[PDB]
């Protein structure tokens, strides 16, 4: 819906392997989820500085 | 040449054609067109064809 997450996560473990089909790597971020407003498997957008 | 031709086709052709006594009005250029230039290296990189 576009609601900004009240909590902030941190990026850790930027991967090194490169996907063959697309040509991109993956990154992992950790987000605290106390109120269970996030569920596994959903689609989200991430802003990285 | 392309910018000038599009400007003529957009803001000059209609007015010049819409005066008194003017018949057919011909344009010696071609208006804009979105050109998509491929790149064979990048097409091979992502496993794609035109």
Swiss-Prot record, chain A:
Cellular localization per UniProt: Cell inner membrane
What happens when the protein's gene is inactivated? Cannot grow on efflux substrates novobiocin or fusidic acid.
Instruction: State the superkingdom.
Output: Bacteria
What the protein does comes down to: AcrA-AcrB-AcrZ-TolC is a drug efflux protein complex with broad substrate specificity that uses the proton motive force to export substrates. This subunit may act as an adapter protein that links AcrB and TolC stably together. It is elongated in shape, being long enough to span the periplasm.
Quaternary structure annotation from Swiss-Prot or TrEMBL: Monomeric in solution. Homotrimeric; interacts independently with AcrB and TolC as well as AcrZ. Part of the AcrA-AcrB-TolC efflux pump. Complex assembly is independent of an efflux substrate and appears to be constitutive.
Record family assignment: Belongs to the membrane fusion protein (MFP) (TC 8.A.1) family.
Name this polypeptide is given: Multidrug efflux pump subunit AcrA
| Gene source species | Escherichia coli (strain K12)
Please indicate which part of the intact protein appears here, giving the first and last residue numbers and the full length.
250 to 298 of 397
Curated annotation (Swiss-Prot), chain B:
Q: Where in or outside the cell?
A: Cell inner membrane
Q: What happens when the gene is disrupted?
A: Loss of susceptibility to contact-dependent growth inhibition (CDI); inhibiting cells still contact the target.
Induction, as annotated: Positively regulated by MarA, Rob and SoxS transcriptional regulators (at protein level).
Record's function text: AcrA-AcrB-AcrZ-TolC is a drug efflux protein complex with broad substrate specificity that uses the proton motive force to export substrates. (Microbial infection) Involved in contact-dependent growth inhibition (CDI), acts downstream of BamA, the receptor for CDI. Its role in CDI is independent of the AcrA-AcrB-TolC efflux pump complex.
Q: How does it assemble?
A: Homotrimer, with large domains that extend into the periplasm, interacts with AcrA and TolC. AcrA may be required to stably link this protein and TolC. Interacts with AcrZ. Part of the AcrA-AcrB-AcrZ-TolC efflux pump.
Which family is this protein grouped under?
Answer: Belongs to the resistance-nodulation-cell division (RND) (TC 2.A.6) family.
Name of the protein: Multidrug efflux pump subunit AcrB
Provide the species name: Escherichia coli (strain K12)
- Gene name as annotated: acrB
């Amino acid at each position: 819906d576009g609601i900004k997450f009240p909590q902030d996560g941190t990026l850790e473990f930027s991967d090194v392997t490169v996907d063959q089909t697309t040509g991109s790597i993956t990154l992992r971020a950790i987000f605290p989820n106390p109120d269970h407003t996030l569920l596994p498997g959903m689609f989200v957008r991430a802003r990285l500085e | 040449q392309e910018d000038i031709s599009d400007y003529v086709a957009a803001n000059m052709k209609d007015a010049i054609s819409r005066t008194s006594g003017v018949g057919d009005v011909q344009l010696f250029g071609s208006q804009y067109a979105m050109r998509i230039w491929m790149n064979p290296n990048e097409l091979n990189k992502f496993q794609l064809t035109p």
